[PDB]
Every structure is written in structure tokens, then in C-alpha cells.
Design a protein around this ligand. Structure first.
Ligand SMILES: Nc1nc2c(ncn2[C@@H]2O[C@H](COP(=O)(O)OP(=O)(O)OP(=O)(O)O)[C@@H](O)[C@H]2O)c(=O)[nH]1
Ligand SMILES: Nc1nc2c(ncn2[C@@H]2O[C@H](COP(=O)(O)OP(=O)(O)O)[C@@H](O)[C@H]2O)c(=O)[nH]1
Ligand SMILES: Nc1nc2c(ncn2[C@@H]2O[C@H](COP(=O)(O)OP(=O)(O)O)[C@@H](O)[C@H]2O)c(=O)[nH]1
Ligand SMILES: [Mg+2]
Lengths: 426, 427, 160, 427
């Protein structure tokens, strides 16, 4: 019925992407060999959103991957669940960039994306009606921020009215892992605000914080970290695939939580969490979700929401539960929390209920949010970007590749209009 | 797909390079005879199953190249990759740069083209030299001038040996190091330095060794080259590219000279007692004793830091370490770079060698840091030349080859131009 | 089994050489038959082949090829004795050893034998010439090699 | 099936022809007596090309050796491969040419050749499909040059439409080992251009240069010098006799290499210049080979490609190599040699692949070409021949025998006719 496409950019995108299709292949009962062996029949009914039918009951992902480092792509090739990916669905380049935005977009961008669109149109015309696209890009990485924008730009120019639901990782206070990250982040937002349908600001620092303070793992390597990120993505995209007592497909999700054509950043959250101390001491009910729904321990972005208000909050609850129990738990806190929310939009939460729980689990809850606490994250991102031009430092690589200095200043014209628009309603 | 090309020029670069590829075959489990994906970055394959290293050793004297031919690795190194210099420049910059080196520099480009067509994908060039040797300062200079002609943008790392602040085995070193800095400013992409005294100093108080050899030095230096290339060598959690930190760790077209610092320098008897946490090693990272550049870190300001963690490290306490780092008031950074950090994480720990003095530790860490305190070393390099050039000392040796007389002072103006900006950028 | 297997590999190299010189061997057989002037009956005996090579051999290369073929047959007969003393065997193994003796026998015929599937001797030799005159002399070596490989596999599967 | 006769003149090719017939006997598995001990019958199908059969299963040479000094005949008869030639193939005279073109042509040559020409009908009429004749001779020695060109005159008139292949050694710039070289060569090339279909030029000096710079043989005796010259012409003839995936007969090379009738001097080469100590240091790869067919060192004449002009090139590949990699890399090298090949013949080259290698080698290539710089090889003679006639040198050895002085002036014009045509059609 509705088909979807997964773009990918960056070396960091591979580990997010590989764990993603590792998580969601399990929840339908697919082995890495490619032979379905399961009992649930509703999965095969709506399997046509992600995969593509092959001979003998096999299905191949509609995952498009773009990178400039074959070494991590070789690992994706040698990965366990990567053996279900299609060969030409891989788009891998031989020349790198160097963690700079210009090399992926202008120089190496002139050749690799011609191999991308042929893969896309090969996958595009085999579908019934394409619901949209997903891209997992970045702001701190040079290659992911680079081609991710040009992946966004030419597809929007090719596809006029569809959905574009992305997942992008934002800078953090204490997990600063690149010097030119403020250079890379700010000008990537320039291509985001004008031209992206959905982006989900996942912050690394909270992912570390939740594995330490909240999931309490002794050695939580990155495979644990991508295990949160993939399940946040699937909570967004389980209503399109699975029937529930209150269904909300992505287009009306894109309608509801995007009130304005620009201010469409999102701040995820997904907390069916259980520490290794606490397997049995929790009382897994709908009321315990609601306290855990707005506790700061559960959200993905390193910000304190008590310095602002939530604009739109969506609480997709997936599992076996009653609607009268669902709404009333949020109905009370809409009345009770008269301060933490925005006042110009009453009834601040519209929910959705899904019946099928995730595998290996009983009942789980998501979160999608736009808030008026993202000023200071956007404020602190801008303030160094202005300060990095006063000393004019590090810019001669971008300058020396044939580019203008004004393109660094034109983003500050555009990013200041972004943060001043958040200032207008606040 | 990726491959690495390394060039060794000078007596030190041959002697340093001897310990380097000794490690490369041992880390990859390859016998020195030349036989037994991850070995793609350093060895080109033979159809019989052998692998040919991608290292070029050029020296103007035969006395150490032919020594390599007498080594056990004579069944490894390619016979045409060793170039015998007919006559040595003998610590005279103008000899190789203007009279002697022209005969054999044509042969080097034949080796470069032969290695380039064998390279299906090039990450960059690796350049090894010391600042005392005339071949290591002059023959590189018209090689680095030449290497810009054929290739303009691919990576060029000039692994350098900075002269020690208090000792030297040379006398015309203030002439040669001045003549080094002119070519590196105009052409060179990246250049790391260490000084022999801190290499002497760390093996005194950490490894507790009284009597080393230069092999006992060069085994430490090759670990740094292993750590920088380990991202390209092996798949890790956070792989880096040469062009990445060439863009990243370099701030400016003038300053591409950061410092090197490695840890843990803990001996085999010594490591059995210790408790090695990542917070332990990173608190051991920023002590001035563990750096291999003898210059006080409190004289300048920190600019950037690269922390190439390797082994079994979980990225949690990595981030809390830098957060613990950033709070202190003793360590001062530059306000125009609040994001001055980057951490590399690779899975495979380094491999110890039989007959070595290091310990088999689970975790290792390197430091690729640039700091404004290095002006004090360069103020000394300007001051030592100023005490030498006032009364026309040693001018006759260089001029007899054909180079001009007053162009010695041109590099003084060019060196001072580099030294003027440390008060501008620094303040 | 490795001591007999070294001679088996040497015989494999010799049989490869004979297969390469199959056209020269066929020409030598035709020349010997023309010299003997008895083309009514097909070649059936190793003793008949030896008598053909002793008197009715024409060329030096033909004599060398006939000597190589006879030496290969003699080496097979000599290695049969060493293969006999390897294991006691079962009744099927004894039957296969008797078959190997019959295949190495000079008095036993060879025309009823045929080349195996991997061998291309039938695909190389002429239709009528291999159908009625000299097919068995060409095809005897590959069937013997297949029987030896089958006996080696049977001994490997048989516990000692 | 296809048969071609070899005539021999001069002591030069008497030293090749022992080595040259060693290789073809080696390729066909032939003992020094002349019988057969081989592995396959594939060579026996076209072993009749250069032999005839004998009663008792023997194979007899198709090579006739003629000289006016009987010393080299008996030495060849008593050489390492001396008991193989049939004993009427040898024809020996009384008075040698004495490095004089005149002496071996008119007063002494005529008595020998009539008995020699009777041997020609004895060898030619035995062949059924006689394609033509080959002749190995010299431009430096008197009998190979003067008496050889007489054979060129007599054979072509009686047998008009055949193929005439001559493998001739040519005088050199600095290995000039005879005083009358511009007298001997010019009195032959006056008739070589006129009456020869295929001519191959062999330069002595390059052969000394080949065995030094890349082979590094310690003692390059004339067995080593005859070794490569035999191997080059062995690879020329293997496409006529041995089947390959893409075949080319001798006339096939004759038609396409010769655009204009007077330009048929060919410049050859042999590819695997692999050394005795670095076999395992070379990846046995066709991407190594093409830069070895077109390097600055692998030629067999004193004709630099930057001083030359490549009209036609034949690259006969021998061994088991893939088709596509060769065909694209042949497409590769014509593109990057933008100014090296000619422009008015697009798609200059022929690839030729023969399946069967030479013995002891996987893949093998011969680079054969025509260049204008053979006139620069000729202009060294041309600047030497014209000035030497002005001072009236060495006339009595020639004009005392009976030729007029006028046709000697024709030769310096006819040799000027040849170099005029190269220079005219160069642009
Ligand atoms: N780190 C390190 N430095 C070395 C080593 N060997 C020599 N040096 C330094 O190099 C400086 C001199 O450079 P050399 O390369 O030895 O001199 P050279 O190449 O012989 O110069 P020429 O005489 O012109 O050929 C000395 O001051 C040493 O401090 C070494 O093995 N490791
Ligand atoms: N969610 C997630 N983020 C990651 C992972 N690995 C790295 N990152 C983030 O990605 C950033 C680096 O991105 P980078 O690799 O330079 O992007 P690229 O150059 O386009 O490949 C770092 O700041 C990390 O915080 C991962 O496995 N999962
Ligand atoms: N490269 C090479 N040159 C030879 C050989 N034999 C003779 N020559 C050359 O031929 C010239 C003498 O020719 P020669 O053999 O005596 O011919 P002839 O006088 O006509 O019998 C000398 O200048 C040599 O350079 C040989 O085996 N190899
Ligand atoms: Mg030296």
C-alpha cells in the first residue's frame, strides 16, 4: 500500500542504520540468511512498507546507504544482519572527505549522487505509492552533514509533495567530539529549516546519561546506545505498520506536530526502561508511564525543560491497555501542569494507541516533542558560530576549496531568524 | 581499498623507520620473510602470496641503507625501493638541496609513480625526518617542494624530530632548522614533532632504563605512528581519516605543528601492580612528564587535543573524563575554541614485541595536541640563530654550493613572521 | 597408505602425460595395426600390445609412447601388490581387488570397458575407431584410476 | 601445414642461429640429436613449420648456412647443438669477404651462390604451402651484408610473391666495432629498402644496455646476448605456428606495420626483464607490463620515444592472461601517450594473444614497432657516411674491384631518400 525509503549518510549513520534493521528484522521474525520463520501473521500483512519481496519468501530492505569510508562499509558488509541488504543498495565511495562539509557536497558530491538516484529510481518505480523518505544524518560529522543536505535538496526538487522524516544528532555540552562541529552544525541547520519535513534532535549526552544513571550498565558500548536510537525510530513508525486501538499514520503525525512551516525540530523520548537492579520491583502500568512520561530522566536531549514549555507532545502508547486508562492519565496532568505547557494551544497532547508490543517486552511508550526549551541549545550553538568568525579561524579550508565567506554569514542571517522566531512566541 | 605511503629521508628516518615496519609485520602477524584486508594499508601483494611494504627509504649515504640490506628483513624490503646515495650531503643543506640531490631525486619520482599506480586508493603520504640532518632537512625540502607539484591536496604528514632544548648531537642545527621551517610553511600539510631529551627523559623515570639504544628510542616513536594510522589500519568504533585531523588538528595555514604524547609508558614489571582505568590514563595524559616535547605546558595555552584511545574502552567514562578535564583552572585553553577535543576509539590493543621493554596492557592512548607554549622552543630556535649569525659564523660552507648569501636573513624574517602571530592569535 | 599414494600420484602424472599424447598413442596403434595387417579383430590384450610394440613399431616417437604406456601398465601392476597388503578388507573389497587384478591382466579383454564421466577419451577419439578398433586401450587407464580411487575411499571409510 | 625457409649468412647469425634454433627446439621438446621427448601432441601439429620429417621418426632442420670463411660453419657443426643440422645445409667457400662489401659480392660471392641457389630449390620445393623465406644477417660483417643482399636480389626475382623477413643487426653509436660500418651498411641498405618485405633492426649497444640496467647479469657473454635476440624472434614466429585466442600470421604483421613501401624497418623489444634475485618481488601482472613495453629503458635501439614517433605497434602477448584487462590497458596507454603515438592513424596498435607461454614463465609480451627515430639511428650513419666520402677513404678495397664511382654517390642520395621520407611524412 504505502512504501518507504531509508536514506543513510555518514560513518556514524552506519551504526545507527545497521542496528535499526537489526532491531526491526527481529520484530518480524527474519533471520540474516533471509528465511522467515515465525507465527505472527500480521507482520507479513504490512511487511511491504519497509522490505521488498524476493523469491522463496525472502524480503530485502529498502535501505539506501551513502558514505565516503569503505572500511566501515566493509564492516557493514561483514556485519551479521547486513547480509540481508541489497548489493547495489549500498552506495560507497572510494574517496573520503576529511570531516569537512564542503568535500562531501561540492567536490565528491558531483559524482557519487548520480549513483544514488539510479538506486532510488530503481527502488522508486517498483513501489505502489511512496509514503516518503528517512535519512539518518548528523550535525557534528563532516560527511553526514554534507551529503545529507544534498540528499535532502535534490530529492525535494525531484519529489514535490511527500514526507521527509529524518533523525539527526545534535551537539552536546560534554560529548564535544569535533572542533569544527560548530562550523558543521550551524550551516547544516540552514538546509534543514527550509527544506526538511521532520528531524528528531537526539543528543548523545543523554544517551550516555540514560545508560549510566538509568539503565545502569557496567560496560555499555555503542551497540547499547544504538539500541535506544533504533527503538525511538520504530516507535515513530509502528503506527504506519501495525493496527492499534488509536492509529495515527505519519502524515497526520506530520500534520499535527508541525504547526508552522519552519519550527519543526523534534525532541524524542522512548522509555520502557528497566535497570538491572529493577527487573521486578517496577509496577508496569499505564499510571507509572505517565510519571515516567515527563520525568527528565527519560528524554533524549540534554536540556532542562523547566526553563520553558512543551509546544506539542505526542504519547504513542504501544501495548495492551484501555483508552479510558490512557487518556485520563494524561487528562489529569493537562489540568494539573498548567505551567509546564504552552497556553496558546489547549489540550496539548493528542495520543495514539498501538496493540502489538515490541518483541522481548510487554508494554512500551514513546514520545515526540517540540518545546520552547530548545532556545538555549540553539542559542549556545549560534554564540560560538559568531565567535568563530571574529577570529576567522579554521575557515580557510572551506575558503580554499573555491567557496565564499558570505555563505558562512548567510547562515547566520538564516539561523538568527530561526532563534528569533522561537523568541517571538516566548 | 585504502593504502598508506611513507617516505624516510635522512639517517634518523632510516633508523626510525627500521623500528616502524618491524612493528607493522608483528602487529599483523607477518613473518619478516614476507609471508604469513587489514594488511591493505601497508603491504602490496605478490601473486605468489608475498606482500611488498609501501615504504620508501632514500639516503644520500649507503652506510645505513646497506645495513638494512644486512638485516633479517632483507627478504622483505623491495630492492628497488632502497636508493643508494652516491655521496652524502653531510649536514650541509645546500649540498643535497642544490648540488648533490638532483642526481637521485629523479629516481625517487620513479619509485613514487610505481607505488602510485600500485595504489588503487591513496590516503596520503608519510614523511619522516629529523631536524639535525642535512639530508633530513634539505633533501626533504626539494622533495616536499616536488611532492606539491604532482599532488596538491592529498595528505602529507611530515613526522619530525624536534631538537632537544638543552642537548644536541649537531652544531649547524640552528642553520638547518631555520632552513627547514621555510619549506614546511610554504608546502607542508601536517607535521608532528618530538624531541630527543624527553624521549630520553621518559625512559629514565617511567621505564626505569639507564642504558638504552636508539632502537629503544625508535620503538616508542613507531607506536605513535601506529596509533595515528590504527584508524586506517583497523576497524574501530570511531575511525578517523588523515584528511580529518589535517583539517581538524591544524588551525591555520601557518601552524601545522602539534605535539605528540603517548601513554601508558609502563614497564612489564610495572603494569602488574597498577589499576588502569581510562580516567587513570587521561589524568596521566596531561601531566608534563609524559609528553615527548620538553617544554612547560603552563607557558602557553592549549588549543586542541586528539585522544586516540585503543583497546577495550567504553565511551561513557571517555566523556566524563573531558568534562572532569574542562573544569580545572590550571589547564587553560583558547576562548576561540571551546570545542577543542576529539577522541578516537579503536578495538585492537597494540602488540608487544619479544625483547621489548613495554607492557602488554589492555588500553593505550595517544595525544596529538597543539599548544601556544611551543613558541618558547621557537623563541630559543630564533635566539640560538641570533647568537650565531651576528658575526658571520659558518657562512662559507653553505655558500660554496651556489646558494645566495643574504637569503639566510630572509628566513629570519620568515621565521619572525611566524613568531609575530603568536602574540596576535595568542592575545 | 601414503607410500602407495605417492606412486598413485606419479601414475596420475603419467596418465595425464598419456592423455596429452593420446593422439600420438592412437597414431602409433594405427601404425602398428597397419604393419601387422590384421585389422579384423580389435586390440584386446596387453600382451598383444607388447607384441605389437616389439616388432610392428615404426617410429621412434611411437616406440617411446608405447614404452611409456607399457611402463604405466607395469607400474600399475607393481602397485597392485603394494595395495593388496594394505588392509584385509571385506568381501566387496576382495571382489574389487579381483576386478583390479582382472583389469591389470594381459589375457583379459578391454573392449567392453568404457570411459568414465570425468574422462573425455570418448569425446576425443573417433566414433568408429573407438567403437570397434581401439577404444578399450585408451579407456583402460581412467577406469583403473577410478577403481583405485573408489578402493581408497572404501578403505578410508572402513575401520582398521 | 605452413612452411617457411631460413637462410643463414655471416658469422653473426651463426651465433644467433645456434641459440635461435635452441629455443624452438626447446619449445618443441627436442633433444640435441633431433628426436622427440615431449608431453603434448599440440606442438606436433605445427612442428612441420620449420622442420621436415625423416625416415625412422626423425625431424630435420629447415636452416641453410652459407659463408665464405669455413671457420664458423664447423664450429656451428661442432657446437652444443651441432649434431642436429643435415649435412648438406652447410655451404662453405674459400676467400672470405674480409668485412668488404665488394669482396663478398662479385668476385667471390658469385661462385658460391650458384651452388647455394641449388640448395634453395631443394628446400623450397619440399614445402607444400611455402609462405616465404627468412634471412638472419649483419650490417657490420662483410659476408652477412654483401653476400646476403645478393641472395635478397636472386630469391625475390625467381619467387616474386612471398614474404621476406630479415632479422638484421644494425651498427651502433658507441659500440662501433668495424671501421667500414657506413660503407658496409649503406651498400646493403641501398638494396635492403629496395627488395625486402620485413626488416628487423637489432642494435648491439641496447643489448649491452638491457643486460646491465635491469637484468644485472654479472658476466654478459655472447650466449646471453644471443639469448634475448632469439627470444624476441621466437615470440614473433609463435603466432604463426602456435594457436592462440587471437592469432596473426606473418603477413598479418607485414600488411599493417607498413603504410608506405619504403618504410619497413622494425624496432623490437621483450617484456619480462625480471631479475634473478627479484622474481618474488614482482607481482606477475599485466598492469606491470604495459609501462614495461613503453618505458624509457626497455627499447632495443638508440631511439628514445621522446626523440621518436610511433606509427605502428604490435604487442604479441604469450601466456595465460585475461582478455579484458589487457584490452582496456592497451586502450589505457594509447590515451595517456597522447603525443607519443601518431595522430593520423587512430587505433594504432594490434594486440596479439598466444595461449602457450614460453617455458618457465607464466605470461610474456613482445613489443614490436616502427618509429621515425630509426632515421636518427640512420642519421648517425648519414652524418658519418657523407663526410667520410668527402675525404676519399677506403676506395681501393672497393673501386679496385670494378664498380664505378657514380653509384656510390647514388647510395648517399638513396640513403638520403629514406630519411627524407621519414622527415616529410612526420608532419
Ligand atoms: N628520534 C630520533 N632522532 C634521531 C635518531 N637518529 C638521529 N636522530 C637525530 O637526528 C639528528 C641528526 O640527523 P641525522 O639523520 O642523523 O643526520 P644525517 O641524515 O646523517 O644528515 P647528513 O649527514 O647530511 O646525511 C641528531 O641530532 C639526532 O638527534 C633516531 O633514531 N631517533
Ligand atoms: N547515535 C550514534 N551516534 C554516534 C555513533 N557514533 C558516533 N556518533 C556521533 O557521531 C558524531 C561523529 O560523526 P561522524 O562519524 O564524524 O559523521 P561522518 O563524518 O559523516 O561519518 C560524534 O559526535 C558522535 O557523537 C553511534 O554509534 N550512534
Ligand atoms: N650482438 C651481437 N653482434 C654480433 C654477433 N656476432 C657478430 N656480431 C657483430 O657483427 C660484426 C661482425 O660480423 P660477422 O659476424 O663477422 O659477419 P661476417 O663478417 O659477414 O661473417 C661485429 O661488428 C659484431 O658487432 C653476436 O653474436 N651478437
Ligand atoms: Mg644522513
Amino acid at each position: 500500500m504505502r512504501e518507504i525509503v531509508h536514506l543513510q549518510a555518514g560513518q556514524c549513520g552506519n551504526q545507527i542504520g545497521a542496528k535499526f534493521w537489526e532491531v526491526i528484522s527481529d520484530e518480524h521474525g527474519i533471520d540474516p540468511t533471509g528465511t522467515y520463520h515465525g507465527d505472527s501473521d500480521l507482520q507479513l500483512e504490512r511487511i511491504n512498507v519497509y522490505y521488498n519481496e524476493a523469491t522463496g519468501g525472502k524480503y530485502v530492505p529498502r535501505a539506501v546507504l551513502v558514505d565516503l569510508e569503505p572500511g566501515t562499509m566493509d564492516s557493514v558488509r561483514s556485519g551479521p544482519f547486513g547480509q540481508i541488504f541489497r548489493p547495489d543498495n549500498f552506495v560507497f565511495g572510494q574517496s573520503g572527505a576529511g570531516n569537512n562539509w564542503a568535500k562531501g557536497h561540492y567536490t565528491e558530491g558531483a559524482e557519487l549522487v548520480d549513483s544514488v538516484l539510479d538506486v532510488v529510481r530503481k527502488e522508486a518505480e517498483s513501489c505502489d505509492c511512496l509514503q516518503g523518505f528517512q535519512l539518518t544524518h548528523s550535525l557534528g560529522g563532516g560527511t553526514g552533514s554534507g551529503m545529507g543536505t544534498l540528499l535532502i535538496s535534490k530529492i525535494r526538487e525531484e519529489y514535490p509533495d511527500r514526507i521527509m522524516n529524518t533523525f539527526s544528532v545534535v551537539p552536546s555540552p560534554k560529548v564535544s567530539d569535533t572542533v569544527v562541529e560548530p562550523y558543521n552544525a550551524t550551516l547544516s541547520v540552514h538546509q534543514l529549516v527550509e527544506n526538511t519535513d521532520e528531524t528528531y534532535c537526539i543528543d548523545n549526552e543523554a544517551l550516555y546519561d540514560i545508560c549510566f544513571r538509568t539503565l545502569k550498565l557496567t560496560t555499555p558500548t555503542y551497540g547499547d546506545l544504538n539500541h535506544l536510537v533504533s527503538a525511538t525510530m520504530s516507535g515513530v513508525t509502528t503506527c504506519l505498520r501495525f493496527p492499534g486501538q488509536l492509529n495515527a499514520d505519519l502524515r497526520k503525525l506530520a500534520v499535527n506536530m508541525v504547526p508552522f512551516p519552519r519550527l519543526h525540530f523534534f525532541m524524542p523520548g522512548f522509555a520502557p526502561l528497566t535497570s538491572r537492579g529493577s527487573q521486578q520491583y517496577r509496577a508496569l502500568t499505564v499510571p507509572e508511564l505517565t510519571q515516567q512520561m515527563f520525568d527528565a530522566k527519560n528524554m533524549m536531549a540534554a536540556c532542562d525543560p523547566r526553563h520553558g514549555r512543551y509546544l506539542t507532545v505526542a504519547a504513542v502508547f504501544r501495548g495492551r491497555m484501555s483508552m479510558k486508562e490512557v487518556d485520563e492519565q494524561m487528562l489529569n496532568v493537562q489540568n494539573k501542569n498548567s505551567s509546564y505547557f504552552v497556553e496558546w494551544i489547549p489540550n496539548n497532547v493528542k495520543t495514539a494507541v498501538c496493540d502489538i508490543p515490541p518483541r522481548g517486552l510487554k508494554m512500551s511508550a514513546t514520545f515526540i516533542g517540540n518545546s520552547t526549551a530548545i532556545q538555549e541549545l540553539f542559542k549556545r550553538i549560534s554564540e560560538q558560530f559568531t565567535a568563530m568568525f571574529r577570529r576567522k579561524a579554521f575557515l580557510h579550508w572551506y575558503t580554499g576549496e573555491g567557496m565564499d565567506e558570505m555563505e558562512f554569514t548567510e547562515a547566520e542571517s538564516n539561523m538568527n531568524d530561526l532563534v528569533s522566531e522561537y523568541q517571538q512566541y516566548q | 581499498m585504502r593504502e598508506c605511503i611513507s617516505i624516510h629521508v635522512g639517517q634518523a628516518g632510516v633508523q626510525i623507520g627500521n623500528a616502524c615496519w618491524e612493528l607493522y609485520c608483528l602487529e599483523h602477524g607477518i613473518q619478516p620473510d614476507g609471508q604469513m584486508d587489514s594488511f591493505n594499508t601497508f603491504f602490496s601483494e605478490t601473486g605468489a602470496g608475498k606482500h611488498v611494504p609501501r615504504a620508501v627509504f632514500v639516503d644520500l649515504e649507503p652506510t645505513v641503507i646497506d645495513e638494512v640490506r644486512t638485516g633479517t628483513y632483507r627478504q622483505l624490503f623491495h630492492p628497488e625501493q632502497l636508493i643508494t646515495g652516491k655521496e652524502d650531503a653531510a649536514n650541509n643543506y645546500a649540498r643535497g638541496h642544490y648540488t648533490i640531490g638532483k642526481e637521485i631525486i629523479d629516481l625517487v619520482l620513479d619509485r613514487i609513480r610505481k607505488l602510485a599506480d600500485q595504489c588503487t586508493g591513496l590516503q596520503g603520504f608519510l614523511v619522516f625526518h629529523s631536524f639535525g640532518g642535512g639530508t633530513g632537512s634539505g633533501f626533504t625540502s626539494l622533495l616536499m617542494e616536488r611532492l606539491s607539484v604532482d599532488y596538491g591536496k592529498k595528505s602529507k604528514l611530515e613526522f619530525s624530530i624536534y631538537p632537544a632544548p638543552q642537548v644536541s648531537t649537531a652544531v649547524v642545527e640552528p642553520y638547518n632548522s631555520i632552513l627547514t621551517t621555510h619549506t614546511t610553511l610554504e608546502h607542508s600539510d601536517c607535521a608532528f614533532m618530538v624531541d630527543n631529551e624527553a624521549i630520553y627523559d621518559i625512559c629514565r623515570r617511567n621505564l626505569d632504563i639507564e642504558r638504552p639504544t636508539y632502537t629503544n628510542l625508535n620503538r616508542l616513536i613507531g607506536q605513535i605512528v601506529s596509533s595515528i594510522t590504527a584508524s586506517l589500519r583497523f576497524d574501530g568504533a570511531l575511525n578517523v581519516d588523515l584528511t580529518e585531523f589535517q583539517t581538524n588538528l591544524v588551525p591555520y595555514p601557518r601552524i601545522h605543528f602539534p605535539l605528540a604524547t603517548y601513554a601508558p609508558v609502563i614497564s612489564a614489571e610495572k603494569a602488574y601492580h597498577e589499576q588502569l582505568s581510562v580516567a587513570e590514563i587521561t589524568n596521566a595524559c596531561f601531566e608534563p612528564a609524559n609528553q615527548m616535547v620538553k617544554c612547560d605546558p603552563r607557558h602557553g595555552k592549549y588549543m586542541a587535543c586528539c585522544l586516540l584511545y585503543r583497546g577495550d574502552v567504553v565511551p561513557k567514562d571517555v566523556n566524563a573524563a573531558i568534562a572532569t578535564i574542562k573544569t580545572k583552572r590550571t589547564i587553560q585553553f583558547v576562548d576561540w575554541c571551546p570545542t577543542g577535543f576529539k577522541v578516537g576509539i579503536n578495538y585492537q590493543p597494540p602488540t608487544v614485541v619479544p625483547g621489548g621493554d613495554l607492557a602488554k596492557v589492555q588500553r593505550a592512548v595517544c595525544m596529538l595536541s597543539n599548544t601556544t607554549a611551543i613558541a618558547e622552543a621557537w623563541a630559543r630556535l630564533d635566539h640560538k640563530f641570533d647568537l650565531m649569525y651576528a658575526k658571520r659564523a659558518f657562512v662559507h660552507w653553505y655558500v660554496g654550493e651556489g646558494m645566495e648569501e643574504g637569503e639566510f636573513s630572509e628566513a629570519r624574517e620568515d621565521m619572525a613572521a611566524l613568531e609575530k602571530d603568536y602574540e596576535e592569535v595568542g592575545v | 597408505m601414503n607410500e602407495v599414494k605417492e606412486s598413485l600420484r606419479s601414475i596420475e602424472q603419467k596418465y595425464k602425460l598419456f592423455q596429452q599424447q593420446q593422439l600420438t598413442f592412437t597414431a602409433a596403434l594405427e601404425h602398428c595395426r597397419e604393419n601387422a595387417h590384421d585389422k579384423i579383430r580389435p586390440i584386446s590384450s596387453i600382451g598383444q600390445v607388447q607384441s605389437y610394440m616389439e616388432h610392428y613399431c615404426n617410429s621412434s616417437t611411437d616406440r617411446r609412447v608405447l614404452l611409456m604406456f607399457l611402463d604405466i601398465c607395469s607400474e600399475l601392476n607393481k602397485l597392485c601388490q603394494h595395495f593388496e597388503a594394505v588392509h584385509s578388507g571385506t568381501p566387496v573389497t576382495n571382489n574389487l581387488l579381483e576386478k583390479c587384478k582382472t583389469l591389470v591382466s594381459q589375457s583379459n579383454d578391454l573392449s567392453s570397458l568404457r570411459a568414465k564421466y570425468p574422462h573425455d577419451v570418448v569425446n576425443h577419439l573417433s566414433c568408429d575407431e573407438a567403437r570397434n578398433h581401439y577404444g578399450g586401450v585408451v579407456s583402460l587407464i581412467p577406469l583403473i584410476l577410478d577403481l583405485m580411487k573408489e578402493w581408497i575411499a572404501h578403505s578410508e571409510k572402513l575401520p582398521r
